[PDB]
Amino acid sequence: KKRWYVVQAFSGFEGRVATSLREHIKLHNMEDLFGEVMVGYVLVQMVMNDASWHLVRSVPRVMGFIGGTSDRPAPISDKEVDAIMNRLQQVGDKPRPKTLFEPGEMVRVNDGPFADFNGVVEEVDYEKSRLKVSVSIFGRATPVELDFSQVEKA
């Protein structure tokens, strides 16, 4: 049975740390002691022998494990690791797709002449990447189209 552990790398070289880790596994052929490697923190399916611990800390650009102690480092509480990974993935879409999607949802404007005003998105357009929200100008909610980054979720 292989349990999970958390590895700290130099933040920014993380994919290269993951590749070098897979390659050190297939060099020192402890293939039965490593399951996966998930992506500044690298998740490793592993078991705990001191040989495999020295292996992971001899992988370059790796600081060390993160646990209660350095003698017997600590598996994984996985309290919101999935949600952290979800965020990492979502970020991609949130930026690339920028799916402007909101209805009856209140938003916030911080761009253009509508800056410093709130309103609701009566219509949303993920394909056109535009949100239809009206901003109470002189009381009159002036339905205007704002980008996801042009306005903030309320």
Partner: protein, 50 residues
């Protein structure tokens, strides 16, 4: 203030405050979607040291 060339010669306190704010934003993100105990213990410890 910048130097002769034009590159801004930045003070040390701006590095310190910018580090504390970068870490505090990361720790708040580790309170919304968040992540397990060991992660937020290292995150709060890096904020403490910052």
């Amino acid at each position: 203030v910048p130097l002769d060339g034009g590159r801004f010669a930045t003070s040390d306190l701006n590095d310190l405050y910018r580090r504390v704010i970068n870490r505090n934003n990361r720790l708040k993100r580790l309170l919304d979607l968040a992540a397990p105990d060991i992660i937020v213990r290292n995150e709060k410890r890096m904020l403490q040291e910052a």
